[PDB]
Amino acid sequence: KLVFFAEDVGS
């Protein structure tokens, strides 16, 4: 599982 969307990097 990856942080696909850039909005999820701060989570």
Epitope: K1, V3, F4, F5, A6, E7, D8, V9, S11
Partner: antibody
Framework: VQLVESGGGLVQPGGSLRLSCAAS????????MSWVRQAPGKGLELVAQ????????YYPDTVKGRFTISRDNAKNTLYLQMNSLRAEDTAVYYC?????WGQGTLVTVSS | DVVMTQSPLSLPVTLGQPASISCRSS???????????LHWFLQKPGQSPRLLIY???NRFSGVPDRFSGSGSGTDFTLKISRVEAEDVGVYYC?????????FGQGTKVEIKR
């Protein structure tokens, strides 16, 4: 990691449908989710996009004001409430976390 | 809206030969964390799209070594080392830097036999 869709099928024009997705194996609450459609022999078209918690929402002007994306971070499920259905909404609807795409549920809008 | 331009739309290619799929971005894809959120997906007939490359050059789990990704800023490219019979499908480029998550028109890869 799995994404199983349900609630798809044949519907009357101007009708309503609600798609459900059972997300498994990867801490659903941590990531953004989306609904992408594909009409017969066509490309990839995003329908709705939700953030990790559910405070931000986006819909293109093709479904805006008729469709609603929602999520339950405790149940690990994603929803799409489709209303005022048109024949142009006939497509295979995938639930995607980006890196993973479910099997896709076929939606048919016909009388 | 961040528009992904793909070329060619149709890709006929001989077995074992290399292939290159171009992708232009309408703006910058570099995010604040330093990663440019540009991915490549493969969709074979009657099946769901599968992620191949995720952040410009990284390949995904189960994805072979023959697939490769390059580019920076606006211009990007997806290269195949050797075209196998199992590579027939529609390849998509995608952006997940900005909201909404967008896609390219898609490249149909064909086996020239």
């Amino acid at each position: 990691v799995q994404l199983v869709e349900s609630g798809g099928g044949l519907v009357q024009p101007g009708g309503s449908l609600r798609l459900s997705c059972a997300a498994s194996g990867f801490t659903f609450s941590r990531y953004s989710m989306s609904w992408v459609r594909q009409a017969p022999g066509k490309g990839l078209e995003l329908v709705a996009q939700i953030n990790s918690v559910g405070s931000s929402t986006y819909y293109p002007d093709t479904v805006k004001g008729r469709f609603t994306i929602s999520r339950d971070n405790a149940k690990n499920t994603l929803y799409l409430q489709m209303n005022s259905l048109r024949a142009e909404d006939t497509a295979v609807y995938y639930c995607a976390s980006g890196d993973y795409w479910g099997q896709g549920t076929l939606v048919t809008v016909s009388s | 809206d961040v528009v992904m331009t793909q070329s060619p739309l149709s890709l006929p290619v001989t077995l074992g030969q290399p292939a290159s799929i171009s992708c232009r971005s309408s703006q910058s894809l570099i995010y604040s964390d330093g990663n440019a959120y540009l991915h490549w997906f493969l969709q074979k007939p009657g099946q769901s799209p599968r992620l191949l490359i995720y952040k410009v050059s990284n390949r995904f789990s189960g994805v072979p070594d023959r697939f490769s990704g390059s580019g920076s800023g606006t211009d990007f490219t997806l290269k195949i080392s050797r075209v196998e019979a199992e590579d027939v499908g529609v390849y998509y480029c995608s952006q997940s830097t900005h909201v909404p998550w967008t896609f390219g028109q898609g490249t149909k890869v064909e086996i020239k036999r």
